[PDB]
């Protein structure tokens, strides 16, 4: 049909891509440790697509473009919604890092307490590093950056709403209760912004599979491996 | 009815591929970090 042809084309495309990526990784490893046959050019590891799929795409696209042609910026106003290559929440992260650092140092000089500057400059360092890594979102560091920033903002929100700050003690007891103010609110807004833009990388890190997930799997070797790891290596597989 | 699928060639490939992919997660996005370490003068 013209329906099973589409399925077949997509299967071939995906398989060619997966194989190219596995080659790139294994070649990077074999090269970093000497064993490579010296006609090898280490620039071939920057070609992301695949040679075959790239050629198909190029030919199809040129056929299309051939047979079909038988602040404020007035020229293009929607420049912010354009794929520039970084994470959307990248300048906000650096802005918040600068605010945290400045406020922490100012407070700890104006009063005499040593926790404000330590927390402020620690968070500032971590958030500047995350906002540096977030300047190329396709890489692996581009995703670990987002994860690091989310962790730091969550910890800030936690310290604010559950333990409070040392320089905010009062004489009373309900006057000095840990509540959410403006720093915790900004950190919460940042966490929501990371979650609702993109934080989906490194999804293969989780808790390992159970014997409950492989009960119905079609693989005997895999099921045996999982049972072995969880302590059931001697049970009988009447399957 | 059933269309006599076992003597065919598109269905055999798609069958084998779907079963293999449904066995276990095969995406390895975190192994690519080695591709960002090929130049280090240490």
């Amino acid at each position: 049909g013209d329906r099973m042809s589409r399925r077949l084309e997509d299967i071939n495309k995906a398989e060619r891509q997966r194989v190219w990526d596995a080659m790139r990784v294994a070649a990077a490893h074999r090269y970093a440790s000497g064993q490579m046959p010296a006609w090898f050019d280490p620039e071939w590891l920057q070609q992301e697509e695949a040679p075959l799929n790239a050629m198909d795409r190029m030919r199809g696209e040129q056929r299309r473009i051939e047979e079909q042609q038988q602040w404020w910026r007035e020229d293009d106003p929607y420049w912010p919604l354009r794929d520039w290559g970084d994470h959307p929440m990248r300048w906000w992260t650096l802005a918040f890092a600068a605010i945290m650092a400045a406020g922490g140092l100012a407070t700890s000089v104006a009063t005499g307490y040593v926790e404000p500057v330590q927390a402020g400059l620690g968070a500032g360092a971590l958030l500047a590093l995350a906002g540096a890594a977030m300047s190329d979102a396709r890489c692996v560091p581009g995703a670990l950056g987002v994860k690091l920033a989310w962790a730091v903002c969550a910890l800030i929100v936690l310290k604010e709403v559950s333990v409070g700050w040392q320089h905010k003690r009062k004489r009373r007891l309900a006057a000095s209760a840990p509540r959410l103010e403006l720093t915790g609110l900004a950190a919460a807004a940042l966490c929501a912004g990371y979650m609702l833009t993109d934080m989906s990388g490194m999804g293969e890190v989780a808790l390992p599979p159970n014997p409950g997930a492989v009960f119905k799997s079609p693989d005997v070797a895999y099921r045996a491996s999982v049972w072995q790891k969880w302590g059931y290596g001697q049970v009988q597989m009447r399957v | 009815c059933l269309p006599n699928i076992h003597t065919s060639n598109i269905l055999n490939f798609t069958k084998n591929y779907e079963i293999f992919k449904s066995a276990k997660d095969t995406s390895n996005f975190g192994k690519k970090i080695i591709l960002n370490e090929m130049q280090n003068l240490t």
Partner: peptide
Amino acid sequence: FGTYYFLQKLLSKYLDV
């Protein structure tokens, strides 16, 4: 952008051979 691309490529080629 990509301002140190060529420099880094040349350097890594010439140093670690």
